[PDB]
Design an enzyme around this catalytic site. Structure first.
Site, PDB file in Angstrom:
ATOM      1  N   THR A 192      16.623 -16.326 113.985  1.00 49.96           N
ATOM      2  CA  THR A 192      15.558 -17.388 113.766  1.00 49.96           C
ATOM      3  C   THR A 192      14.696 -17.905 114.953  1.00 49.96           C
ATOM      4  O   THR A 192      15.158 -17.972 116.091  1.00 49.96           O
ATOM      5  CB  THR A 192      16.250 -18.629 113.199  1.00 49.96           C
ATOM      6  OG1 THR A 192      16.877 -18.242 111.996  1.00 49.96           O
ATOM      7  CG2 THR A 192      15.307 -19.779 112.833  1.00 49.96           C
ATOM      8  N   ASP A 202       9.989 -19.262 111.140  1.00 51.99           N
ATOM      9  CA  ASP A 202       9.787 -17.905 110.641  1.00 51.99           C
ATOM     10  C   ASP A 202      10.578 -17.770 109.342  1.00 51.99           C
ATOM     11  O   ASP A 202      11.145 -18.750 108.862  1.00 51.99           O
ATOM     12  CB  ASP A 202      10.205 -16.855 111.677  1.00 51.99           C
ATOM     13  CG  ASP A 202      11.703 -16.641 111.728  1.00 51.99           C
ATOM     14  OD1 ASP A 202      12.441 -17.629 111.931  1.00 51.99           O
ATOM     15  OD2 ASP A 202      12.141 -15.483 111.561  1.00 51.99           O
ATOM     16  N   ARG A 216      12.741 -14.766 108.547  1.00 62.56           N
ATOM     17  CA  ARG A 216      13.714 -13.672 108.577  1.00 62.56           C
ATOM     18  C   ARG A 216      15.139 -14.205 108.475  1.00 62.56           C
ATOM     19  O   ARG A 216      15.485 -15.197 109.109  1.00 62.56           O
ATOM     20  CB  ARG A 216      13.577 -12.835 109.851  1.00 62.56           C
ATOM     21  CG  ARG A 216      14.523 -11.642 109.890  1.00 62.56           C
ATOM     22  CD  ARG A 216      14.249 -10.740 111.080  1.00 62.56           C
ATOM     23  NE  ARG A 216      13.060  -9.914 110.882  1.00 62.56           N
ATOM     24  CZ  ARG A 216      12.591  -9.038 111.768  1.00 62.56           C
ATOM     25  NH1 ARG A 216      13.203  -8.860 112.935  1.00 62.56           N
ATOM     26  NH2 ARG A 216      11.501  -8.336 111.486  1.00 62.56           N
ATOM     27  N   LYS A 232      13.428 -21.743 105.640  1.00 67.04           N
ATOM     28  CA  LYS A 232      14.218 -22.445 106.650  1.00 67.04           C
ATOM     29  C   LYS A 232      13.782 -23.896 106.823  1.00 67.04           C
ATOM     30  O   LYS A 232      14.381 -24.636 107.605  1.00 67.04           O
ATOM     31  CB  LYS A 232      14.109 -21.712 107.981  1.00 67.04           C
ATOM     32  CG  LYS A 232      14.520 -20.258 107.882  1.00 67.04           C
ATOM     33  CD  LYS A 232      14.370 -19.552 109.210  1.00 67.04           C
ATOM     34  CE  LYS A 232      14.562 -18.058 109.048  1.00 67.04           C
ATOM     35  NZ  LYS A 232      14.632 -17.389 110.371  1.00 67.04           N
ATOM     36  N   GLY A 280      20.641 -20.886 112.969  1.00 64.73           N
ATOM     37  CA  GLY A 280      22.076 -20.648 113.128  1.00 64.73           C
ATOM     38  C   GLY A 280      22.711 -20.097 111.866  1.00 64.73           C
ATOM     39  O   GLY A 280      22.131 -19.243 111.195  1.00 64.73           O
ATOM     40  N   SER A 286      17.145 -18.042 118.115  1.00 60.62           N
ATOM     41  CA  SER A 286      17.148 -16.877 119.007  1.00 60.62           C
ATOM     42  C   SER A 286      15.798 -16.657 119.686  1.00 60.62           C
ATOM     43  O   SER A 286      15.740 -16.175 120.820  1.00 60.62           O
ATOM     44  CB  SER A 286      17.549 -15.612 118.241  1.00 60.62           C
ATOM     45  OG  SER A 286      16.724 -15.417 117.106  1.00 60.62           O
ATOM     46  N   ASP A 334      10.858 -11.542 119.496  1.00 57.31           N
ATOM     47  CA  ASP A 334      12.292 -11.676 119.213  1.00 57.31           C
ATOM     48  C   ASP A 334      12.673 -10.878 117.968  1.00 57.31           C
ATOM     49  O   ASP A 334      12.083 -11.061 116.900  1.00 57.31           O
ATOM     50  CB  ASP A 334      12.669 -13.149 119.028  1.00 57.31           C
ATOM     51  CG  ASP A 334      14.140 -13.343 118.704  1.00 57.31           C
ATOM     52  OD1 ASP A 334      14.990 -12.695 119.352  1.00 57.31           O
ATOM     53  OD2 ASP A 334      14.447 -14.150 117.800  1.00 57.31           O
ATOM     54  N   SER A 355      13.806 -12.754 114.821  1.00 58.18           N
ATOM     55  CA  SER A 355      12.790 -13.429 114.019  1.00 58.18           C
ATOM     56  C   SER A 355      11.760 -12.439 113.492  1.00 58.18           C
ATOM     57  O   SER A 355      11.546 -11.377 114.085  1.00 58.18           O
ATOM     58  CB  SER A 355      12.096 -14.497 114.859  1.00 58.18           C
ATOM     59  OG  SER A 355      13.050 -15.325 115.497  1.00 58.18           O
TER      60      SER A 355
HETATM   61  C1  LIG Z   1      17.660 -16.129 112.875  1.00 61.62           C
HETATM   62  C2  LIG Z   1      17.175 -15.107 111.811  1.00 61.62           C
HETATM   63  C3  LIG Z   1      18.932 -15.504 113.452  1.00 61.62           C
HETATM   64  O1  LIG Z   1      19.095 -16.089 114.745  1.00 61.62           O
HETATM   65  C4  LIG Z   1      18.074 -17.512 112.186  1.00 61.62           C
HETATM   66  O2  LIG Z   1      18.959 -18.226 113.056  1.00 61.62           O
HETATM   67  C5  LIG Z   1      18.740 -17.469 110.789  1.00 61.62           C
HETATM   68  C6  LIG Z   1      18.824 -18.897 110.285  1.00 61.62           C
HETATM   69  C7  LIG Z   1      18.286 -19.110 108.846  1.00 61.62           C
HETATM   70  C8  LIG Z   1      18.532 -17.947 107.861  1.00 61.62           C
HETATM   71  C9  LIG Z   1      18.954 -20.376 108.280  1.00 61.62           C
HETATM   72  N1  LIG Z   1      20.145 -17.065 110.850  1.00 61.62           N
HETATM   73  C10 LIG Z   1      20.671 -16.095 110.099  1.00 61.62           C
HETATM   74  O3  LIG Z   1      20.040 -15.382 109.318  1.00 61.62           O
HETATM   75  C11 LIG Z   1      22.178 -15.941 110.252  1.00 61.62           C
HETATM   76  C12 LIG Z   1      22.522 -15.277 111.555  1.00 61.62           C
HETATM   77  C13 LIG Z   1      23.903 -15.465 111.710  1.00 61.62           C
HETATM   78  C14 LIG Z   1      24.803 -14.457 111.359  1.00 61.62           C
HETATM   79  C15 LIG Z   1      26.173 -14.652 111.519  1.00 61.62           C
HETATM   80  C16 LIG Z   1      26.656 -15.855 112.031  1.00 61.62           C
HETATM   81  C17 LIG Z   1      25.763 -16.864 112.381  1.00 61.62           C
HETATM   82  C18 LIG Z   1      24.392 -16.667 112.222  1.00 61.62           C
HETATM   83  N2  LIG Z   1      22.634 -15.147 109.106  1.00 61.62           N
HETATM   84  C19 LIG Z   1      23.477 -15.655 108.204  1.00 61.62           C
HETATM   85  O4  LIG Z   1      23.967 -16.782 108.266  1.00 61.62           O
HETATM   86  C20 LIG Z   1      23.816 -14.727 107.051  1.00 61.62           C
HETATM   87  C21 LIG Z   1      23.095 -15.232 105.834  1.00 61.62           C
HETATM   88  C22 LIG Z   1      23.199 -14.124 104.775  1.00 61.62           C
HETATM   89  C23 LIG Z   1      22.354 -12.901 105.164  1.00 61.62           C
HETATM   90  C24 LIG Z   1      22.719 -14.672 103.425  1.00 61.62           C
HETATM   91  N3  LIG Z   1      25.264 -14.778 106.856  1.00 61.62           N
HETATM   92  C25 LIG Z   1      26.055 -13.920 107.500  1.00 61.62           C
HETATM   93  O5  LIG Z   1      25.648 -13.049 108.267  1.00 61.62           O
HETATM   94  C26 LIG Z   1      27.543 -14.106 107.272  1.00 61.62           C
HETATM   95  C27 LIG Z   1      28.038 -15.077 108.303  1.00 61.62           C
HETATM   96  C28 LIG Z   1      28.929 -16.061 107.575  1.00 61.62           C
HETATM   97  C29 LIG Z   1      29.669 -16.777 108.544  1.00 61.62           C
HETATM   98  C30 LIG Z   1      31.034 -17.005 108.349  1.00 61.62           C
HETATM   99  C31 LIG Z   1      31.776 -17.716 109.291  1.00 61.62           C
HETATM  100  C32 LIG Z   1      31.165 -18.211 110.437  1.00 61.62           C
HETATM  101  C33 LIG Z   1      29.809 -17.995 110.639  1.00 61.62           C
HETATM  102  C34 LIG Z   1      29.066 -17.290 109.698  1.00 61.62           C
HETATM  103  N4  LIG Z   1      28.163 -12.816 107.535  1.00 61.62           N
HETATM  104  C35 LIG Z   1      28.294 -11.891 106.594  1.00 61.62           C
HETATM  105  O6  LIG Z   1      27.944 -12.045 105.424  1.00 61.62           O
HETATM  106  C36 LIG Z   1      28.923 -10.593 107.116  1.00 61.62           C
HETATM  107  N5  LIG Z   1      29.843  -9.944 106.159  1.00 61.62           N
HETATM  108  C37 LIG Z   1      29.160  -9.406 104.952  1.00 61.62           C
HETATM  109  C38 LIG Z   1      30.155  -8.571 104.229  1.00 61.62           C
HETATM  110  O7  LIG Z   1      31.178  -9.503 103.877  1.00 61.62           O
HETATM  111  C39 LIG Z   1      31.911  -9.998 105.032  1.00 61.62           C
HETATM  112  C40 LIG Z   1      30.990 -10.815 105.797  1.00 61.62           C
HETATM  113 MG   LIG Z   2      12.102  -4.082 112.135  1.00 62.86          MG
END
Ligand SMILES: *[C@@](C)(CO)[C@](*)(O)[C@H](CC(C)C)NC(=O)[C@H](Cc1ccccc1)NC(=O)[C@H](CC(C)C)NC(=O)[C@H](CCc1ccccc1)NC(=O)CN1CCOCC1
Ligand SMILES: [Mg+2]
Ligand SMILES: *[C@@](C)(CO)[C@](*)(O)[C@H](CC(C)C)NC(=O)[C@H](Cc1ccccc1)NC(=O)[C@H](CC(C)C)NC(=O)[C@H](CCc1ccccc1)NC(=O)CN1CCOCC1
Ligand SMILES: *[C@@](C)(CO)[C@](*)(O)[C@H](CC(C)C)NC(=O)[C@H](Cc1ccccc1)NC(=O)[C@H](CC(C)C)NC(=O)[C@H](CCc1ccccc1)NC(=O)CN1CCOCC1
Ligand SMILES: [Cl-]
Ligand SMILES: [Cl-]
Ligand SMILES: [Mg+2]
Ligand SMILES: [Mg+2]
Ligand SMILES: [Mg+2]
Ligand SMILES: [Mg+2]
Ligand SMILES: [Mg+2]
Lengths: 222, 195, 204, 222, 233, 196, 214, 195, 196
Positions: free
Chosen positions: A1, A17, A19, A33, A47, A129, A166, A169
């Protein structure tokens, strides 16, 4: 993000953004978001995706009940205080990094909150990020006494910096403008500079391509 | 290691369970019965962590027997298997989970059909024509996949079972000291004394 | 010892013109060992469909849980639950276990009975909602499904065309994943009829 | 402690036709969430109608390509300017990779060209030197996204002849250079949408009996 | 296996129509301590190349010695050492890149990130990066450390692709670099206000600017900031 | 951080830099580390931003409730409430706080509270990562019963050096003056203090 | 990695059968991998464990076998060939080589011979060997149906059917089946057989796999 | 888990070695001969790390055979055992030691006496009336300590050996697939084909 | 340790404390950390006592052999020999050395060599654990072209503060004066410097 917040003359603007990632994979190319805590208090979230949505909805619910109890329009400092105390209690395990902004009877406000519960005050802020790419733009082009139109431009330019530079994003730019004495305007997909080009070929299959073993009518009725 | 096998044929369910109990470098016993009768037409075999296996099996047995007395009625194999699965599903997120894998062989008197359920320690339930736990399936499933027919008799099922035990006795590193075989059908539960 | 990849499996959902589709493979394994080829991962509560991938015990548990909750919903509300509402219920229920989560990747699919609008949604294991116009993917071949769907998908497909697209997306994704396959099922969902088709695929 | 390896991202793709072969790759170079270059080529003409790409850790990839180019040069000196056949090059590259079996080149290598019958040839290598000739091969970050699509569209996997009860497979056939480039472009635009390390640009090297031709296409820069 | 001790932070650079610009601050940090303030991290080689180095300063001084010895060795038995057979930026870069990759392959790296900026004999701009891993890449803008995260986004707004290079003047490019160095002073905790800047032009040659300072900073708004939320005083 | 509090003739002055870091990234360059817990009892915050904010908010709550019941609290009382929190939660906190206040009876007072949760009443106190570099300077240059202008210069020169050598300190120099006259906020920018 | 390879001695020589799948974790890298290495026209080797280690060193082995017959003017024994390879990998023991192979050949003095050679230095002569992630599944079909007096046709089917058994159950085995028949006059290739098509075909014709709907 | 036993009786030395070769969860072979003839009246059995065992045994075999040719003379069991011990004593402080345990059964033609030597991988040599390696002695030594008499015949020694194998087959966790038995006496080395 | 070297009008003065520690135990309270590598090239040693002694002994050997062949070496040359040892053996050494010398042409020169093996020519240098506490003091009080008496006072006051705050520094303050006149050793005891 990438998320940002920018103060101007008669209010505040926030942007983000669209993504959503799952490792190196883009799960949602157009996720929202920007969250509404109250009608004129909005929150940009970075986050852990579930945590930002969950914590903003919980505090938003309690803010509504508080607004009804006190017969007053909710204040940004109340949302700020409720959020930080909640986040602090969970010692950073709720991975919500927020930019809280809005207008209330006291005026216009802009804050940031981190997962461990620390808050900051500013005229321009960035989280996520892509915050460094965004902050580079903000530090280059920000000035005191911005107009509404100038603040939207600066905010979206800061998000664009994150989108392009980034890898965390991408896609589109969402904006919300909170001006004093006016309704807050949520500008979903304010910019869409990442439209997918026409494909070279259609992959519509001839009917009967897929081999089938059994067919059956499913009963959804009672 | 603890070997437990299960085969559902036309009119019955057959369970085969190894007799060895090993602790360290010593086979402490070679006649252990790794099963409990839950109800007159339902049998559960088990394998896993020492102590947990018997403690779990007897706890289930007590609960099903309690139900039978209360309602003056025998629970269906499906109902028993669902109850067992839920208990294991609770267990896996407990402070100290039951590390027990089970097979539930039963004859449903209302449907007049034999039923075999495979449930691992996580609470993962599947209904199968034939089943196993541990490394046992790694040897036997290729034989069952080949020779298993759905319309087999009890005698044909026992011969197929003999084929599996022979393959295990040939290729498995340890001595599991043979198997106790039990049959579940419309007339209830009985043990094959000569195997 | 990664709970979400012990049993294996995949689910994909797609939107078409006045319709939706949801499909899943039928495999259930214990790591390398294939255990069942009849383990369906799609369930329905009234006209709302729910696919679930991940740890099989949690798949079974959550189905039983949402059946529980949707039955009580219906008794009190005197009407069947809609996809948008159900989506929020799934999200709430999963986030309730935020620090001891079910290891699952659920997918909601259905048509709103009032508005007639096709609806799909995906979730992560702690309940983050991923709403989408086009498609949702889940499981151990999610990367593969993203690649197929992103190239094969086009908007406003008719039920008969949509069936072919989703089936091909699933089949070819499943064949590049060791832990998925062993059979497949596709639900084609129209406003007041639902067809369920079992696909023929390689059994290795 | 010092880690001698890195991940520069990127993805590559080699397809073999009847009388031609293509080797494509994106031009984006990354470290973590940063973009190092939007145009850094990693598909090279190595002489003797052989094109090569070594994707993964760029430092190892450049070293390998550089050593193979040098191997081609010395093959001419030592064997009276004999043309290095694609199969001979493949075997040579195995020995280059396996020579560092206990401190590997962290790369996925693909070469393309024409065999001694004039027919299109693609070879793919693992980091330690195991190789195989193939019609179709994707390598790198988004290989998992691209490859099952190729299985479906190049090798026609899971596609049965309409009306034949899934008994008669759809017949294999050679594609034109135009149809192959369509699949390459659609493969990379799809991978660009869903993989954060893929984008910026697409450079394709096409190999025919006439020589080595290049084609470049823009990709999304987010 | 090393650990860096005395370190230099970002090196930033970009191409413009007739040449290249490169810059780096004059600081040698010792962890959080801003120990040394008179450190030159831009090192010219001849009148057509400037090597900008970040990371370990002891390893930087070693590279200085190698480059200085390279110039000496090139002049041996070379009547055209100040003409056709003079050292090119591409020669100097490939040498360093060879050394950096060899050292990482012996598990004894030079703990540096290097940018070689210069103009070739045919007038072409040269700008390429190499680091402790032997990784190399080129781009219209290049930056190390924090510069990669904060400077590149600003420099890429000026030169976003190859076609933007002829449209970019030396005045505009220098302005962007100087602006970027200010942003790094705002936001990088191991940066200094004092820096050096070098321009290598195909017409006006090498211009080396020392003792520059970040200026025209915005700090006034700080007086209006009170507390961290509720505090009014 | 670099923070300090210095007693003088008319009362006490608190001083601080404005830098907040995440590793080497400056998350906030205009931070306010001088925070009010009562009208004329303030504190300088160092360590975890989250921990010090949570603590100061609780102390402000305790002193507001104290004031409603028992009237204006002493600076010693404020320091005791800080200590109680820092000492009893020492395992979960990273907070180095300096408490400074002005009474009419006791005049200017300074209490420093290190990591362990101990309390130390001093004529002046320095804390934060950047304080290490100015122990020598402050010890040689501090005098008791200084004037307001002398005390301002002392803090300015001290924090100027702390900022110069410490990468974790920088930005503007904020100061808060506590006297019988009232509460005065001061700020000093880089162009001024850097070239001292 | 994942694989199912087998080789067995019988009346008519040696049958060698392997699967074709290569996996990097759950990701299926290839379905068209060659796990039989044609060392020379008379000698075959199976690939299990490290793909590179097996390819590189069994190709190297063919070079050593060619040098042997150039110097001795006689075909190399399977015993000596297996020994050159096992002695070689034993030198590298501890370094991290990963190899589980069957060196198969048919000579005059020995007859049909199989040597299981392995990266920790093991060298075993035997009649039946199965190696890989799906070895247990293949052993079951082999043990129950194996006889010395098998015909060449029936022996080829047994090896094909045994791989199919593993391909079905073992997730990391599948793709296609490659068959080989080794005779005294050299080995004979008996084609590539897609498991997808082969499974349905065997199901119908044999009556096996009733648990699978088709 | 590789079982090797040795019994020295009045006029001969008897060595018994398990036939199983196990790798993972599969018994790859059930007819493996874990011994090498070093000379006409000297036999060495072995057990330990895979690969090392055979490589070591054959290396020793080659060295003793070389000595025999050079001197046209057979080395005494004592001399062979000392040579073997030294090689293992060198090995233990090498970069990669031989992890091999051996028994050396031989008949000294000059003394007209049978001799059994037990040498572990460290180079620890002992002359014994009966010996074993691994866990084998944990079961059998109590039987040998009881029934072993120094004046036994070869047939009495084989019956005593049968008693040990029976006890191992009863109490040991794994299936070692029986044993190959070999006798060393004045007439040389021969194998008992029916055991 | 606390060590420093300061250039002035007539040449250069080296300064040091006399404490050697093993954990918290003072193994030697009268250590001599100012060591001669040539007639008028000396060094200040900090870090490992074993490493710095071994290095200084090797440098002294190199400069003795240099002198036999090429005449008197420069202070820069001495610093280069130190650097070569510290840089090439950085993985196995813990040595923070300041090199100071007097030429007739170049006058007083000071080179500091930190842990990595880098070289830095400076007007004055401070090093050792106790130097951290006097960065502010030394920066504010140092002037170029000071007199001998001013430079002695500067070093005395600086190391006095370093000793006061650093537990790893203490004992006596040793100093070595390098000028055209010759080599002068100075010593200052606790009773004098503590009450400055
Ligand atoms: C930018 C894009 C990234 O820096 C933004 O910060 C966005 C924020 C918006 C969407 C609110 N962040 C994310 O997209 C975020 C990045 C992330 C990943 C992992 C940990 C922390 C941050 N992504 C997520 O939160 C996704 C959302 C999904 C795609 C709907 N979730 C996951 O990736 C989860 C993480 C869940 C989690 C559990 C415990 C502690 C922290 C996070 N991970 C999975 O689903 C992975 N895996 C899938 C298969 O089943 C087992 C789990
Ligand atoms: Mg690409
Ligand atoms: C100077 C800087 C040091 O003495 C001052 O003391 C200031 C005090 C002011 C702001 C009140 N201190 C900080 O700026 C402080 C430094 C710090 C960091 C970690 C532990 C203790 C002190 N910075 C913070 O508290 C930041 C503030 C955020 C950026 C708004 N928070 C973090 O750095 C968090 C804190 C997590 C934490 C760890 C241990 C104890 C308590 C809290 N850390 C991260 O977000 C992790 N970060 C991820 C990226 O990699 C670097 C680490
Ligand atoms: C001040 C004290 C610090 O800056 C000075 O730098 C002086 C420099 C003078 C003496 C040249 N430094 C020391 O006194 C130095 C401190 C030190 C300790 C360890 C590593 C580096 C620096 N002290 C020593 O070198 C002592 C001298 C002995 C007591 C005569 N030696 C030790 O402390 C040895 C050194 C072992 C060592 C470790 C790592 C790198 C190099 C050498 N350590 C011990 O004997 C272990 N000791 C056992 C009891 O438990 C405490 C540790
Ligand atoms: Cl703060
Ligand atoms: Cl000393
Ligand atoms: Mg599959
Ligand atoms: Mg390699
Ligand atoms: Mg600073
Ligand atoms: Mg399979
Ligand atoms: Mg002291």
């Amino acid at each position: 993000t990438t998320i940002v917040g920018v103060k101007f003359n008669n209010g505040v603007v926030i942007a983000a953004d669209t993504r959503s990632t799952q490792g190196p994979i883009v799960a949602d190319k157009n996720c929202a978001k920007l969250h509404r805590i109250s009608p004129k208090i909005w929150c940009a979230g970075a986050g852990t995706a579930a945590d930002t949505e969950a914590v903003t909805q919980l505090i938003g619910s309690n803010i509504e009940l508080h607004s009804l109890y006190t017969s007053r329009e909710p204040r940004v400092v109340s949302a700020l205080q409720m959020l930080k105390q909640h986040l602090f209690k969970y010692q950073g395990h709720i991975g919500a990094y927020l930019i809280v902004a809005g207008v209330d009877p006291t005026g216009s406000h802009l804050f940031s909150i981190h997962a461990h519960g620390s808050t900051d005050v500013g005229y321009y802020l960035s989280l996520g990020s892509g915050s460094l790419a965004a902050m580079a733009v903000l530090e280059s082009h920000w000035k005191q006494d911005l107009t509404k139109e100038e603040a939207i431009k600066l905010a979206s330019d800061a998000i664009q910096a994150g989108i392009w530079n980034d890898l965390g994003s991408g896609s589109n730019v969402d904006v919300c403008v909170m001006e004093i004495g006016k309704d807050a305007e949520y500008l979903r997909n304010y910019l869409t500079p990442n439209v997918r080009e026409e494909k070279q070929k259609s992959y519509k299959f001839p009917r009967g391509t897929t081999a089938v073993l059994k067919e059956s009518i499913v009963n959804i009725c009672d | 290691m603890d070997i437990i096998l299960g085969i559902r044929v036309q009119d019955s369910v057959i369970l085969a369970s190894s007799k060895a109990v090993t602790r360290g470098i010593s086979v402490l016993k070679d006649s252990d019965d790794k099963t409990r009768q839950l109800s007159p037409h339902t049998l559960m075999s088990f394998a896993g962590e020492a102590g947990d296996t018997v403690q779990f099996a007897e706890y289930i047995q007590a609960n099903i027997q309690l139900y039978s007395i209360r309602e003056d009625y025998e629970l269906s194999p499906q109902a028993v298997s669902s109850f067992v699965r839920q208990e294991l599903a609770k267990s896996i997120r407990s402070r100290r989970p039951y590390q027990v894998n089970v097979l539930i062989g039963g004859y449903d008197k209302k449907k007049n059909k034999p039923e075999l359920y495979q449930i691992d320690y996580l609470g993962t339930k599947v209904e199968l024509p034939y089943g196993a736990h541990g490394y046992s399936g790694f040897y036997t499933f290729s034989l069952l996949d080949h020779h298993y027919r759905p319309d087999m008799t009890t005698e044909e099922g026992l011969d197929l079972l003999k084929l599996c035990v022979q393959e295990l006795e040939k290729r498995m590193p340890m001595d599991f000291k043979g198997v106790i075989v039990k049959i579940v059908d419309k007339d209830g539960i009985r043990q094959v004394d000569d195997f | 010892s990664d709970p979400s990849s012990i049993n294996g499996g995949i689910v994909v959902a797609m939107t078409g013109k006045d319709c939706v589709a949801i499909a899943c493979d039928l495999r259930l394994g214990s790591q390398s060992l294939g255990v069942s080829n009849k383990f369906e991962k799609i369930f329905h509560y009234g006209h709302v469909f729910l696919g679930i991938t991940g740890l099989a015990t949690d798949v079974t548990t959550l189905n039983e849980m949402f059946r529980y909750k949707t039955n009580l919903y219906k008794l009190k509300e005197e009407r069947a639950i809609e996809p948008e509402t159900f989506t929020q219920l799934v999200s709430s229920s999963l986030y309730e276990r935020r620090f001891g989560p079910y290891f699952v990747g659920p997918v909601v699919a259905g048509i709103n009975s009032k508005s007639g609008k096709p609806f799909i949604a995906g979730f992560d294991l702690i309940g983050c909602i991923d709403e989408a116009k086009d498609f949702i993917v889940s499981g151990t071949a999610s990367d593969q499904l993203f690649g197929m769907c992103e190239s094969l998908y086009e908007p406003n497909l008719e039920p008969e065309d949509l069936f072919e697209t989703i089936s091909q997306a699933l089949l070819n994704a499943a064949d590049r994943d060791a832990l998925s396959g062993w059979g497949a099922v596709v639900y084609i969902i129209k406003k007041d009829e639902v067809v369920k088709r079992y696909l023929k695929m390689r059994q290795d | 402690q010092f880690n001698p390896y890195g991940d520069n991202g990127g993805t590559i793709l080699g397809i073999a036709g009847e009388d031609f072969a293509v080797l494509a790759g994106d031009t984006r170079n990354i470290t973590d969430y940063s973009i190092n270059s939007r145009y850094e080529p990693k598909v090279f003409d190595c002489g003797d109608n052989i094109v090569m790409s070594a994707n993964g850790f760029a430092a190892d990839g450049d070293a390998l390509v550089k050593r193979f180019k040098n191997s081609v040069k010395w093959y001419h000196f030592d064997h009276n300017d004999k043309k290095l056949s694609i199969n001979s090059a493949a075997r040579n590259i195995q020995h280059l990779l396996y020579g560092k079996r206990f401190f590997p080149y962290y790369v996925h290598t693909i070469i393309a060209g024409l065999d001694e019958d004039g027919k299109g040839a693609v070879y793919s290598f693992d980091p330690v030197g195991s190789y195989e000739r193939e019609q179709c091969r994707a390598g790198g970050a988004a290989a998992s996204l691209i490859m099952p699509f190729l299985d479906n569209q190049v090798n026609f996997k899971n596609q049965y002849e309409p009306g034949t009860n899934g008994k008669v497979k759809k017949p294999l056939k050679y594609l034109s250079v135009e149809e192959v480039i369509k699949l390459v472009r659609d493969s990379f635009t799809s991978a660009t949408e869903r993989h954060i390390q893929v984008g910026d640009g697409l450079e394709i090297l096409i190999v025919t009996k006439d020589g080595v031709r290049k084609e470049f296409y823009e990709l999304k820069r987010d | 296996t090393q650990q860096p001790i005395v370190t230099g932070t970002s090196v930033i650079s970009m191409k413009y129509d007739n040449g290249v610009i490169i810059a780096a601050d004059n600081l040698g940090s010792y962890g959080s301590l801003l120990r040394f303030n008179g450190v030159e991290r831009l090192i010219p080689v001849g009148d057509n190349t400037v090597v900008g180095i970040s990371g370990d300063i002891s390893d930087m001084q070693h590279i200085e010695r190698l480059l200085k010895d390279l110039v000496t060795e090139n002049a041996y038995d070379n009547p055209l050492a100040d003409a056709e057979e003079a050292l090119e930026p591409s020669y100097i870069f490939e040498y360093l890149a060879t050394v950096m990759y060899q050292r990482r392959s012996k598990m004894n790296p030079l703990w540096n990130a290097i940018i070689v900026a210069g103009v070739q004999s045919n007038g072409d701009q040269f700008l390429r990066y190499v680091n402790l891993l032997g990784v190399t890449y080129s781009s219209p803008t290049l930056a190390t450390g924090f510069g990669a995260h904060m400077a590149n986004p600003l420099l890429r707004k000026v030169v976003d692709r190859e076609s933007d290079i002829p449209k970019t003047t030396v005045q505009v490019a220098e302005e962007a670099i100087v602006n970027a160095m200010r942003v790094l002073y705002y936001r990088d905790a191991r940066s200094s206000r004092n820096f050096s800047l070098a321009i290598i032009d195909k017409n006006t040659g090498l211009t080396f600017k020392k003792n520059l300072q970040v200026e025209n900073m915005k700090w006034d708004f700080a007086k209006d900031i009170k507390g961290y939320g509720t505090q009014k005083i | 951080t670099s923070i300090m509090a210095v007693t003088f003739k008319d009362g006490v002055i608190l001083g601080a830099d404005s830098r907040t870091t995440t590793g080497a990234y400056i998350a906030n360059r205009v931070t306010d580390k001088l925070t009010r817990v009562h009208d004329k009892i303030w504190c300088c915050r160092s360590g975890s931003a989250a921990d010090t904010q949570a603590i100061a908010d609780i102390v402000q709550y305790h002193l507001e409730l104290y004031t409603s019941q028992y009237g204006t609290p002493s600076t010693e009382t404020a320091a005791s409430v800080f200590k109680e929190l820092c000492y009893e939660n020492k395992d979960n906190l990273t907070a180095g706080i300096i408490v400074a206040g002005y009474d009419d009876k006791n005049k200017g007072e300074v209490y420093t509270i290190p990591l362990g949760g101990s309390v130390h009443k001093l004529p002046y106190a320095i804390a934060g990562s950047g304080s290490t570099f100015i122990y020598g300077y402050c010890d040689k240059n501090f005098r008791e019963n200084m004037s307001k202008e002398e005390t301002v210069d002392f803090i300015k020169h001290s924090l100027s050096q702390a900022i110069k050598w410490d990468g974790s300190s920088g930005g503007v120099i904020r100061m808060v003056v506590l006297t019988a006259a009232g509460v005065e906020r001061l700020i000093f920018y880089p162009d001024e203090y850097e070239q001292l | 990695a994942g694989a199912t390879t087998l080789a067995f001695r019988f009346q008519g020589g040696i049958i060698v059968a392997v699967d074709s799948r290569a996996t990097a974790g759950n990701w299926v890298a290839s379905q068209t991998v060659k796990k039989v290495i044609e060392i020379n026209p008379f000698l075959l080797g199976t690939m299990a464990g490290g793909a590179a280690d097996c390819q590189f060193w069994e190709t190297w082995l063919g070079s050593q076998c060619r040098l042997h017959e150039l110097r001795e003017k006689e075909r190399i024994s399977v015993a000596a060939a297996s020994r050159i390879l096992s002695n070689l990998v034993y030198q590298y023991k501890g370094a991290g080589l990963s190899m589980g192979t069957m060196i198969c050949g048919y000579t005059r003095k020995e007859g049909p011979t199989i040597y299981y050679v392995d990266s920790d230095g093991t060298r075993l002569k035997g009649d039946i060997f199965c190696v890989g992630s799906g070895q247990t599944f293949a052993y079951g079909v082999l043990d129950s149906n194996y006889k010395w007096d098998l015909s060449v046709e029936d022996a080829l089917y047994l090896g094909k059917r045994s791989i199919l058994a593993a391909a079905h159950r073992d997730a990391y085995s599948g793709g296609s089946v490659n068959l080989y028949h080794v005779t005294e006059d050299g080995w004979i290739y008996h084609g590539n057989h897609d498991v997808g098509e082969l499974f349905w075909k065997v199901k119908e014709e044999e009556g096996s796999f009733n648990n699978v709907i088709g």
